[PDB]
Design a protein around this ligand. Structure first.
Ligand code: HEM
Ligand SMILES: O=C(NO)c1ccccc1O
Ligand code: NA
Length: 249
């Protein structure tokens, strides 16, 4: 929607296809899908529509951006991918990381998020502080996803469902544990667990709980808890948009 994707060479397209396969096997074996989804989303989620700065242009590999507190632990993800990236010198880091995020969702059983190549790596990381704060609520979520990224309220709730895989770590954010009973399985359980309340061994952030009390977010939580197909459709739409912020406009 509103996108005009660039032309890339046949050899570039060949590399995308081969890298997709290599990433599947690597991410599945290493059990790092959630960390790779977090990497891709943290790279993309810095987009500010007003200034057209940040976004999915490969800058998350820069030591300066990895040092942002919201990126605690993503240095591990960058290191894990570097040997594989080196097998695909023709690819931009931006394309590679966004492809890794799409693959992370696929190999855990989630929707097939469309992918288009051609992002060009940008020289300078954006300023720290654009990623969302786990202790804040719905006004903050709309500031970050809406006023900065330019995504919709539907996209906020669907993308929050990325917590359906993975966990927090007390040494990284300070929060601790998985949102779901099957942290390597991508399904609608994040919403089921959010709605059933606190269960021992499972995590809810204040930012997750904010979805339950908001008049626009709550009907979406309910929809996704009742209808995984609907969640998968809206998730794929939102993740594609996120992965393409500032790209091919
Ligand atoms: C809605 C606002 C969000 C907030 C406040 C938030 C906050 C957090 C926090 C505090 C952690 C734990 C980090 C750690 O301690 O390891 C985390 C992890 C994670 N986030 Fe988010 N997040 C948000 C949105 C998203 C989005 C949009 C996605 C992707 C679609 C996402 C994907 C993930 C994943 C997969 C993990 C698990 C990482 C792992 O298992 O190592 N999050 N998030
Ligand atoms: O990993 C995160 N989000 O996915 C995250 C981690 C720490 C602080 C804020 C955040 O948004
Ligand atoms: Na899960």
């Amino acid at each position: 929607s509103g996108k005009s994707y660039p032309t890339v060479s046949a050899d570039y397209q060949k590399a995308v296809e081969k890298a997709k396969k290599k990433l599947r096997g690597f991410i599945a074996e290493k059990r790092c899908a959630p960390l790779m989804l977090r990497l891709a989303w943290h790279s993309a989620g810095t987009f500010d529509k007003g200034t057209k700065t940040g976004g999915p242009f490969g800058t998350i590999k820069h030591p300066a951006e990895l040092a942002h507190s919201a990126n605690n632990g993503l240095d591990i993800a960058v290191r894990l991918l570097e040997p594989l990236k080196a097998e695909f010198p023709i690819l931009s880091y931006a394309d590679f990381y966004q492809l890794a995020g799409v693959v992370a969702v696929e190999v855990t059983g989630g929707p097939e998020v469309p992918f288009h190549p051609g992002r060009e790596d940008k020289p300078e990381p954006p300023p720290e502080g654009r990623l969302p704060d786990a202790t804040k609520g719905s006004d903050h979520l709309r500031d970050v996803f809406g006023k900065a990224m330019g995504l919709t309220d539907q996209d906020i709730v669907a993308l929050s469902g990325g917590h359906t895989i993975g966990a927090a770590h007390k040494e990284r954010s300070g929060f601790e544990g998985p949102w779901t009973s099957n942290p390597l399985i991508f399904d609608n359980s994040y919403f089921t667990e959010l709605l059933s309340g606190e269960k021992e061994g499972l995590l809810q952030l204040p930012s997750d709980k904010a979805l339950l009390s908001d008049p626009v977010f709550r009907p979406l939580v309910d929809k996704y808890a009742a209808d995984e197909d609907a969640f998968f459709a809206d998730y794929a739409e939102a993740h594609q948009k996120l992965s393409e912020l500032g790209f091919a406009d």
